[PDB]
Amino acid sequence: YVPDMGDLIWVDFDHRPAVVLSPFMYNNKTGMCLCVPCTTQSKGYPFEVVLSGGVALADQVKSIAWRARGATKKGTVAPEELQLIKAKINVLIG
Amino acid sequence: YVPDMGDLIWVDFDHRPAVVLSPFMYNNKTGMCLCVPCTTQSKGYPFEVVLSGGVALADQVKSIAWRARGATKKGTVAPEELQLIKAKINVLIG
């Protein structure tokens, strides 16, 4: 398994699922991916994106070592959901 | 001290300096900032940005709790350096 853009993944720990934002070829070459965490409770807060099936926290992007921490695919997000997450990060650091 | 976009900061630990990418008003309201880490040795690697005075690792952006971990201002980066870091992240997750 190599994560792809728009997957929902769980990572191992010593967890909350995450939405993968970087492309397959970056992910495979480096063993890392950029992603944002998800929580269960909606809260009006401006950087939340509602997922159908979660709320993604777009402002908390992170680089994560997916390969060295054994990631598992939980599902995928809708394409309009992914595109909303990218647009909120872009406003913040674009 | 509240970090601003383009500052170089050290954070406390239990470190490497970081270039701040998010705006002052986000930083002040939340107590968090998005930033990228710096290392000392250049390496040809494609996501490096050379700093004059470091190499910023643009692909390793992270959300960091600056307030709750006592940040100190080390200096600032050149405006063309900051703009190069933002453009490489944009290619990767824009």
From Swiss-Prot, chains A, B:
<dbReference type="GO" id="GO:0044877">
    <property type="term" value="F:protein-containing complex binding"/>
</dbReference>
<comment type="similarity">
    <text>Belongs to the PemK/MazF family.</text>
</comment>
<keyword id="KW-0805">Transcription regulation</keyword>
<keyword id="KW-0051">Antiviral defense</keyword>
<keyword id="KW-0540">Nuclease</keyword>
<protein>
    <recommendedName>
        <fullName>Endoribonuclease toxin MazF</fullName>
        <ecNumber>3.1.27.-</ecNumber>
    </recommendedName>
</protein>
<keyword id="KW-0694">RNA-binding</keyword>
<dbReference type="GO" id="GO:0040008">
    <property type="term" value="P:regulation of growth"/>
</dbReference>
<dbReference type="GO" id="GO:0044010">
    <property type="term" value="P:single-species biofilm formation"/>
</dbReference>
<dbReference type="InterPro" id="IPR011067">
    <property type="entry name" value="Plasmid_toxin/cell-grow_inhib"/>
</dbReference>
<keyword id="KW-0678">Repressor</keyword>
<dbReference type="GO" id="GO:0003677">
    <property type="term" value="F:DNA binding"/>
</dbReference>
<dbReference type="GO" id="GO:0016075">
    <property type="term" value="P:rRNA catabolic process"/>
</dbReference>
<dbReference type="GO" id="GO:0003723">
    <property type="term" value="F:RNA binding"/>
</dbReference>
<keyword id="KW-0013">ADP-ribosylation</keyword>
<dbReference type="GO" id="GO:0110001">
    <property type="term" value="C:toxin-antitoxin complex"/>
</dbReference>
<dbReference type="GO" id="GO:0140677">
    <property type="term" value="F:molecular function activator activity"/>
</dbReference>
<dbReference type="GO" id="GO:0006417">
    <property type="term" value="P:regulation of translation"/>
</dbReference>
<keyword id="KW-0238">DNA-binding</keyword>
<keyword id="KW-0346">Stress response</keyword>
<keyword id="KW-0255">Endonuclease</keyword>
<dbReference type="GO" id="GO:0006402">
    <property type="term" value="P:mRNA catabolic process"/>
</dbReference>
<dbReference type="InterPro" id="IPR003477">
    <property type="entry name" value="PemK-like"/>
</dbReference>
<dbReference type="GO" id="GO:0006355">
    <property type="term" value="P:regulation of DNA-templated transcription"/>
</dbReference>
<dbReference type="GO" id="GO:0030308">
    <property type="term" value="P:negative regulation of cell growth"/>
</dbReference>
<keyword id="KW-0810">Translation regulation</keyword>
<dbReference type="GO" id="GO:0043068">
    <property type="term" value="P:positive regulation of programmed cell death"/>
</dbReference>
<dbReference type="GO" id="GO:0009372">
    <property type="term" value="P:quorum sensing"/>
</dbReference>
<feature type="region of interest" description="Loop 2, involved in substrate recognition">
    <location>
        <begin position="40"/>
        <end position="48"/>
    </location>
</feature>
<dbReference type="Pfam" id="PF02452">
    <property type="entry name" value="PemK_toxin"/>
</dbReference>
<comment type="function">
    <text>Might also serve to protect cells against bacteriophage; in the presence of MazE-MazF fewer P1 phages are produced than in a disrupted strain. For strain K38 most wild-type cells are killed but not by phage lysis; it was suggested that MazE-MazF causes P1 phage exclusion from the bacterial population. This phenomenon is strain dependent.</text>
</comment>
<dbReference type="GO" id="GO:0032991">
    <property type="term" value="C:protein-containing complex"/>
</dbReference>
<dbReference type="GO" id="GO:0051607">
    <property type="term" value="P:defense response to virus"/>
</dbReference>
<keyword id="KW-1277">Toxin-antitoxin system</keyword>
<dbReference type="GO" id="GO:0004521">
    <property type="term" value="F:RNA endonuclease activity"/>
</dbReference>
<dbReference type="GO" id="GO:0042803">
    <property type="term" value="F:protein homodimerization activity"/>
</dbReference>
<comment type="function">
    <text>Toxic component of a type II toxin-antitoxin (TA) system. A sequence-specific endoribonuclease it inhibits protein synthesis by cleaving mRNA and inducing bacterial stasis. It is stable, single-strand specific with mRNA cleavage independent of the ribosome, although translation enhances cleavage for some mRNAs. Cleavage occurs at the 5'-end of ACA sequences, yielding a 2',3'-cyclic phosphate and a free 5'-OH, although cleavage can also occur on the 3'-end of the first A.</text>
</comment>
<comment type="subunit">
    <text>Probably a dimer. Forms a heterohexamer composed of alternating toxin and antitoxin homodimers MazF(2)-MazE(2)-MazF(2). The binding site of MazE and ssRNA or ssDNA are largely overlapping; the presence of only 1 MazE molecule inhibits mRNA endoribonuclease activity. Binds to EDF but not a mutated EDF (NNGNN).</text>
</comment>
<keyword id="KW-0673">Quorum sensing</keyword>
<keyword id="KW-0378">Hydrolase</keyword>
<keyword id="KW-0804">Transcription</keyword>
